[PDB]
Amino acid sequence: GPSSQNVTEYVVRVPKNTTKKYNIMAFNAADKVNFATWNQARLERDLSNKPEDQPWLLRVNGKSGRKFKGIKKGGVTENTSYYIFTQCPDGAFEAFPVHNWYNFTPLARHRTLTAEEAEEEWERRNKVLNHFSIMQQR
Amino acid sequence: FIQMSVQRIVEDAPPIDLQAPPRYLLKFEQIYLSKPTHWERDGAPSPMMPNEARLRNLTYSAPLYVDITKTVIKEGEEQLQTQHQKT
Amino acid sequence: KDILCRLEHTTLRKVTANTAIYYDPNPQSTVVAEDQEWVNVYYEMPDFDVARISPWLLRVELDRKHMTDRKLTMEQIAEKINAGFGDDLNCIFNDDNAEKLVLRIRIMNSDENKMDDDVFLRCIESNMLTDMTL
Amino acid sequence: GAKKSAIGQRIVATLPYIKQEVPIIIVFRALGFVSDRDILEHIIYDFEDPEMMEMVKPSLDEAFVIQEQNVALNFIGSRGAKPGVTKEKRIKYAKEVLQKEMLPHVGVSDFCETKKAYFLGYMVHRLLLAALGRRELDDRDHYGNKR
Amino acid sequence: VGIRFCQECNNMLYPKEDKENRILLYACRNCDYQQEADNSCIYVNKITHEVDELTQIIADVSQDPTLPRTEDHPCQKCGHKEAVFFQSHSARAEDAMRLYYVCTAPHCGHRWTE
Amino acid sequence: PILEFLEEWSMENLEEISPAAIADATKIFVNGCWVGIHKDPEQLMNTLRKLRRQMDIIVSEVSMIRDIREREIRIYTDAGRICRPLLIVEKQKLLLKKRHIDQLKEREYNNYSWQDLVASGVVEYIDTLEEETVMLAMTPDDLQEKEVAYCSTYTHCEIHPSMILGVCASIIPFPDHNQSPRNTYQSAMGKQAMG
Amino acid sequence: AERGELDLTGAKQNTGVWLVKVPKYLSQQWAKASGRGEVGKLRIAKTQGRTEVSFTLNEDLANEHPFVLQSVGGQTLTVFTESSSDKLSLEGIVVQRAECRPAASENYMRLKRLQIEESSKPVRLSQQLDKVVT
Numbered sequence: 001g002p003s004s005q006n007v008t009e010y011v012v013r014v015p016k017n018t019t020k021k022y023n024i025m026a027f028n029a030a031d032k033v034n035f036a037t038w039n040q041a042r043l044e045r046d047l048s049n050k051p052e053d054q055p056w057l058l059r060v061n062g063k064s065g066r067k068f069k070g071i072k073k074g075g076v077t078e079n080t081s082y083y084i085f086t087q088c089p090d091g092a093f094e095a096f097p098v099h100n101w102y103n104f105t106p107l108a109r110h111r112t113l114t115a116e117e118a119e120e121e122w123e124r125r126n127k128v129l130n131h132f133s134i135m136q137q138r
Numbered sequence: 139f140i141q142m143s144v145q146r147i148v149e150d151a152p153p154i155d156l157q158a159p160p161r162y163l164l165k166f167e168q169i170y171l172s173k174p175t176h177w178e179r180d181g182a183p184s185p186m187m188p189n190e191a192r193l194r195n196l197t198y199s200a201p202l203y204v205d206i207t208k209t210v211i212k213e214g215e216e217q218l219q220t221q222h223q224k225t
Numbered sequence: 226k227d228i229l230c231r232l233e234h235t236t237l238r239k240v241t242a243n244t245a246i247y248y249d250p251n252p253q254s255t256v257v258a259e260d261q262e263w264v265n266v267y268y269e270m271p272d273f274d275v276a277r278i279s280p281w282l283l284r285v286e287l288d289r290k291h292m293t294d295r296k297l298t299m300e301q302i303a304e305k306i307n308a309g310f311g312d313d314l315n316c317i318f319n320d321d322n323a324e325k326l327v328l329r330i331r332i333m334n335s336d337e338n339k340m341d342d343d344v345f346l347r348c349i350e351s352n353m354l355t356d357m358t359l
Numbered sequence: 360g361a362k363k364s365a366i367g368q369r370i371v372a373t374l375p376y377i378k379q380e381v382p383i384i385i386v387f388r389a390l391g392f393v394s395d396r397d398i399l400e401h402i403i404y405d406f407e408d409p410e411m412m413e414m415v416k417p418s419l420d421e422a423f424v425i426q427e428q429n430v431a432l433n434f435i436g437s438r439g440a441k442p443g444v445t446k447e448k449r450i451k452y453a454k455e456v457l458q459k460e461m462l463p464h465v466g467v468s469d470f471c472e473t474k475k476a477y478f479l480g481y482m483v484h485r486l487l488l489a490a491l492g493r494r495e496l497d498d499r500d501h502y503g504n505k506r
Numbered sequence: 507v508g509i510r511f512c513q514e515c516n517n518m519l520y521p522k523e524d525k526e527n528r529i530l531l532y533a534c535r536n537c538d539y540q541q542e543a544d545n546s547c548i549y550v551n552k553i554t555h556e557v558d559e560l561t562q563i564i565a566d567v568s569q570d571p572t573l574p575r576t577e578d579h580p581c582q583k584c585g586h587k588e589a590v591f592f593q594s595h596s597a598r599a600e601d602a603m604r605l606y607y608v609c610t611a612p613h614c615g616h617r618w619t620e
Numbered sequence: 621p622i623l624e625f626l627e628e629w630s631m632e633n634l635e636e637i638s639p640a641a642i643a644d645a646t647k648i649f650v651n652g653c654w655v656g657i658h659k660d661p662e663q664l665m666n667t668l669r670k671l672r673r674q675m676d677i678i679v680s681e682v683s684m685i686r687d688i689r690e691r692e693i694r695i696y697t698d699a700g701r702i703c704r705p706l707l708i709v710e711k712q713k714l715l716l717k718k719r720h721i722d723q724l725k726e727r728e729y730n731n732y733s734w735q736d737l738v739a740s741g742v743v744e745y746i747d748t749l750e751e752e753t754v755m756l757a758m759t760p761d762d763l764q765e766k767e768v769a770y771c772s773t774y775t776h777c778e779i780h781p782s783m784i785l786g787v788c789a790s791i792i793p794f795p796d797h798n799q800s801p802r803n804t805y806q807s808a809m810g811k812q813a814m815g
Numbered sequence: 816a817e818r819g820e821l822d823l824t825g826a827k828q829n830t831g832v833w834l835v836k837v838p839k840y841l842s843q844q845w846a847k848a849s850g851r852g853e854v855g856k857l858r859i860a861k862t863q864g865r866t867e868v869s870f871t872l873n874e875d876l877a878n879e880h881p882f883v884l885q886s887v888g889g890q891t892l893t894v895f896t897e898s899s900s901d902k903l904s905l906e907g908i909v910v911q912r913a914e915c916r917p918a919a920s921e922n923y924m925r926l927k928r929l930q931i932e933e934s935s936k937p938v939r940l941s942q943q944l945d946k947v948v949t
């Protein structure tokens with residue numbers, strides 16, 4: 001059929017400027033990120049430093065859902081550029097430079113030991129009993 | 139070291155910023171070397187041959203000159219840039 | 226050479242090939258298929274372990290060549306472990322006829338009937354490998 | 360020991376400008392990698408190798424208590440040559456030590472934590488290969504190691 | 507032998523026993539998460555560790571110009587006459603003299619020991 | 621210049637990869653800094669060697685080392701690396717041909733010098749780390765000639781074996797006929813001679 | 816609905832996008848005009864059991880770029896944008912990765928040398944003075 005020898009060629013357009021900047025969001029494969037449950041999400045700059053040069057914080061489904069932290073790619077693409085092709089009704093490809101690259105990793109939510117609490121465990125760090133029990137006590 | 143390290147080191151140094159409030163900025167950007175020179179009692183420079191350095195117990199050194207750019211801000215929305223060539 | 230063996234220090238590590246802390250909840254049904262054949266032989270008339278038995282199991286395989294080189298048989302090794310640990314550990318071993326020499330170890334039944342039922346085996350396993358003297 | 364030899368052999372790191380060494384997993388926690396999978400992916404590049412996995416187990420247990428980057432940074436800062444007056448200052452100091460003093464050749468920029476983590480993972484991976492006997496120890500006399 | 511990580515926080519799963527059912531469970535720490543274990547072996551160490559060096563050997567070694575090459579040991583997989591042979595020469599053996607062979611033919615990284 | 625070329629070629633940066641891919645790919649190190657990974661290490665080394673021999677982006681003193689067993693390519697560009705020139709061998713044949721010698725013979729009034737040998741890709745510098753991956757021939761007329769195939773994959777050839785000696789050891793006549801310590805004694809004595 | 820809400824509509828439609836790595840000169844040529852609405856044509860040819868991707872530079876722009884696809888299963892990538900009106904949205908999900916390579920081999924390095932030399936123009940070296948500064 002035609003698919004056995006189909007040939008597709010489309011024009012490339014590079015708008016001089018766009019109101020919205022383009023950046024790449026990357027999720028590790030082991031994270032098994034799924035967008036079906038992403039009913040709501042929040043993306044904002046971090047508050048630990050306390051803006052344009054600070055890490056980004058991603059929250060999904062408010063506090064109930066998983067939380068991810070994005071960090072700008074330190075390595076710069078001085079000799080390289082990245083572009084994204086998006087299908088359009090006119091049938092011509094459009095390429096947008098990648099303003100930034102961000103790597104997001106999940107943040108597990110649970111009663112993580114506080115800094116003060118960890119000090120007590122440091123005494124028994126070398127010799128501890130029933131690693132499971134330590135979390136139950138906390 | 140002469141052709142690269144000396145120049146790289148000076149350019150690596152951050153510009154000097156001084157606040158009194160007028161702001162003074164000093165930047166070292168270009169390096170210059172002359173032939174090994176010796177200065178007499180009268181102060182007349184003459185090229186220093188190594189044998190003269192050996193015989194007269196003179197160190198065989200070359201004068202080092204740096205271009206310096208000085209910009210001054212007087213908190214009056216005026217900027218004046220002056221450069222001292224071959225310091 | 227017999228005098229040489231009685232002088233050179235030999236520990237369980239030298240004569241043991243590999244060890245594995247198998248779960249083995251029910252001694253009657255062993256996780257290891259081959260182990261089942263001879264384990265049942267020791268379980269027709271169990272002694273001192275009928276009341277209770279630690280769910281965890283420790284299986285150690287003894288290299289045949291090393292055992293023969295030191296003239297060590299399956300018997301005194303069990304006796305030494307029992308003698309060293311008294312009734313703390315119950316030791317069950319196969320017959321030399323089988324191509325593989327095995328020695329199943331479990332914690333005393335009285336303790337089963339405080340540190341950890343699982344991590345304690347590792348402490349014993351490491352301790353018996355080096356500190357214990359055959 | 361009873362539990363000393365049960366866990367095995369644990370890895371430690373002696374970072375610059377720190378009085379005492381720290382568990383290796385702690386430095387990974389400070390760099391921003393929290394979960395064990397994330398840290399191990401930087402150290403063990405093949406998860407089908409059971410021998411390599413067992414080597415890091417004692418290190419994970421030692422740093423099991425610390426589970427957050429700020430906690431890890433505070434732990435490093437608490438051991439600094441100039442202990443911080445408060446927790447907030449300690450973290451800033453600890454972050455600065457890692458940012459500049461630790462693996463400076465890898466980078467000094469604020470977004471170089473991943474690069475430093477990968478190299479620190481490589482340092483741990485190289486140590487494991489030596490411990491497992493897969494790679495022979497480096498020779499001080501070998502003149503290609505000299506400058 | 508297998509190492510399992512929690513599906514929630516991607517942390518290590520450690521063995522645990524449930525007295526209610528008496529079945530091995532790999533329970534996550536600081537995550538109140540549990541999984542149904544199947545291997546039933548929580549720990550195993552081989553002191554002898556007669557690990558087949560063929561697993562550790564890498565097919566790319568055939569590209570090393572410093573390794574000897576023999577025409578007397580053709581590759582069984584493809585019949586190529588040339589092969590690159592070498593010793594493991596790695597610690598933990600105490601006897602490293604047997605030669606491991608790697609087929610020199612490209613796309614056939616077959617490794618064998620005579 | 622080294623890093624720019626690697627990025628242009630199929631070298632995946634550390635940031636833009638999944639750690640699961642580090643298993644098969646070879647790590648790329650530049651001056652000790654892990655830059656990225658590569659899938660075709662054999663082609664990368666061939667390209668790097670070709671560029672260096674052409675006095676392209678890579679300069680002559682840049683040393684590329686491939687650890688085939690360890691799946692690592694290390695590139696060094698810093699100072700203090702001791703290296704020596706060696707003749708290149710391809711297909712058991714020196715790239716140094718009679719035409720190179722003839723041009724050298726008329727060294728003056730011809731502008732042909734040692735640099736043209738390096739530019740021509742006939743001789744390249746090899747540092748001690750790179751020498752571990754080099755299969756070296758002591759002489760061309762005895763090592764890479766058709767004979768009992770001790771080795772048929774020579775990559776380099778010594779210009780002359782006597783270049784392993786230094787200034788003071790180079791005045792000893794027939795030093796290969798002397799017991800070695802007496803060659804060490806002469807190197808000390810030759811500095812105290814008169815002239 | 817809030818300022819920080821992310822418009823995940825693109826994810827719902829499962830829109831597919833391609834990530835391409837291209838050199839500077841190709842982008843540098845595009846950046847020259849960058850307002851003509853045209854920089855070239857992307858040609859994709861498929862066969863019975865093989866597909867090839869190539870790109871052609873515009874004739875006016877110049878006054879062959881074969882494309883090699885890459886696996887995307889090892890990592891999941893998504894594209895999002897930040898609107899100037901503080902309205903973040905998800906453009907789509909990356910479905911394929913490709914790389915752009917130079918067709919030429921020998922003369923291509925000449926442009927690379929000029930690029931390196933051009934990058935060396937800001938780089939500065941010490942200069943000799945024939946006469947002592949007075």
Ligand SMILES: [Zn+2]
Binds near residue numbers: 512534
């Ligand atoms: Zn968990």
Ligand SMILES: [Zn+2]
Binds near residue numbers: 584585614615
């Ligand atoms: Zn083959």
